[PDB]
Amino acid sequence: HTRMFSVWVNGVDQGDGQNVYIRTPPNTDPIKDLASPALACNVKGGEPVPQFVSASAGDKLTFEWYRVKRGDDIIDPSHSGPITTWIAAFTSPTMDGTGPVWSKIHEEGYDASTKSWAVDKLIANKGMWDFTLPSQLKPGKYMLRQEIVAHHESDATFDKNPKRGAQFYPSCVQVDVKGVGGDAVPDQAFDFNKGYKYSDPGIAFDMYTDFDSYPIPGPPVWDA
Ligand SMILES: OC[C@H]1O[C@@H](O[C@H]2[C@H](O)[C@@H](O)[C@H](O[C@H]3[C@H](O)[C@@H](O)[C@H](O[C@H]4[C@H](O)[C@@H](O)[C@H](O[C@H]5[C@H](O)[C@@H](O)[C@H](O[C@H]6[C@H](O)[C@@H](O)[C@H](O)O[C@@H]6CO)O[C@@H]5CO)O[C@@H]4CO)O[C@@H]3CO)O[C@@H]2CO)[C@H](O)[C@@H](O)[C@@H]1O
Ligand SMILES: [Cu+2]
């Protein structure tokens, strides 16, 4: 259990984002049903918030996460798994992030050298998660989506044991991308309800064995 507090732009906190520029769900509960409309932007994903983060293409962004209170333990260390970041054009305000619209822009999963997960790193860096807005990206509004997947109970699938299964923690942020950017339009058009399946070995994943690597679900990072 976890959710986002604010976004930082080149190391500058834009201030509490919850129901401002983040589509903040009412609590920290996980999505587990891969058929749920909420898989994409969580439980209030379809409700506009009034603001957009201001950034230029190429800018470094930091997503800041918390569990109960800002600056706390962030998420339970049991909750090992990867952290992926996505982009989609802002089609209309009542978009909810369903359909074939997403391109993946960053991922960290399992680092075998350190035996460290993305989540272990999120914790040790106090809920701060960094990535870059592609410098080639075309100026305009987009939704960013960033997702912690936790695998403490991914050793079964939800469809077989509803009391278990992988847990998805998606956060969608509204961003007005300015500066020069380039001509890149995100064009992987990945659909989460279609594209995440119980058969994916990055979902049906047993973290309680001697494993050497973790296959992160979805396409590779957008070639930009
Ligand atoms: O399978 C074989 C292997 O098993 C391993 O053991 C595993 C085991 O399999 C697995 O089932 C187990 O799972 C437990 C997790 O480890 C543990 O983290 C999890 O704790 C949850 C807890 O269930 C939940 O209630 C709690 O909810 C909080 C939430 O954190 C918090 O954000 C929210 O806060 C709200 C405030 O209260 C409110 O004031 C404010 O306004 O809103 C906030 C939210 O917006 O409150 C809720 C409820 O109070 O979250 C915690 C986690 O943070 O429990 C799981 C059990 O169901 O893990 C085991 C390992 O750890 C063996 O280890 C291995 O040997 C075997 O091979
Ligand atoms: Cu949890």
Curated annotation (Swiss-Prot):
Record-level GO cellular component terms: extracellular region
Record flagged with keyword Disulfide bond: yes
Cofactor: Cu(2+)
Top-level taxon of the source organism: Eukaryota
Keywords: Carbohydrate metabolism, Cellulose degradation, Copper, Disulfide bond, Metal-binding, Monooxygenase, Oxidoreductase, Polysaccharide degradation, Secreted, Signal
Applied relevance: Lignocellulose is the most abundant polymeric composite on Earth and is a recalcitrant but promising renewable substrate for industrial biotechnology applications. Together with cellobiose dehydrogenases (CDHs) an enzymatic system capable of oxidative cellulose cleavage is formed, which increases the efficiency of cellulases and put LPMOs at focus of biofuel research.
Sites where the protein binds (1,4-beta-D-glucosyl)n: 45, 76, 78, 155
Binding site for O2: 152
Entry's Gene Ontology BP terms: cellulose catabolic process
Catalytic activity of the protein: [(1->4)-beta-D-glucosyl]n+m + reduced acceptor + O2 = 4-dehydro-beta-D-glucosyl-[(1->4)-beta-D-glucosyl]n-1 + [(1->4)-beta-D-glucosyl]m + acceptor + H2O
The record's free-text note on cofactor binding: Binds 1 copper ion per subunit.
Record's subcellular location: Secreted
Enzyme class: oxidoreductase
EC number: 1.14.99.56
GO molecular function: metal ion binding; monooxygenase activity
S-S bonds: 41-172
Binding site for Cu(2+): 1, 79, 169
Membrane-crossing segments per the record: none
Function (record text): Lytic polysaccharide monooxygenase (LPMO) that depolymerizes crystalline and amorphous polysaccharides via the oxidation of scissile alpha- or beta-(1-4)-glycosidic bonds, yielding C4 oxidation products. Catalysis by LPMOs requires the reduction of the active-site copper from Cu(II) to Cu(I) by a reducing agent and H(2)O(2) or O(2) as a cosubstrate. Cleaves a range of polysaccharides, including cellulose, xyloglucan, mixed-linkage glucan and glucomannan.
Family, similarity comment: Belongs to the polysaccharide monooxygenase AA9 family.
Name assigned to this protein: AA9 family lytic polysaccharide monooxygenase A
Annotated source species: Collariella virescens (Soil fungus)
Organism taxonomic ancestry: Eukaryota, Fungi, Dikarya, Ascomycota, Pezizomycotina
Gene for this chain: AA9A
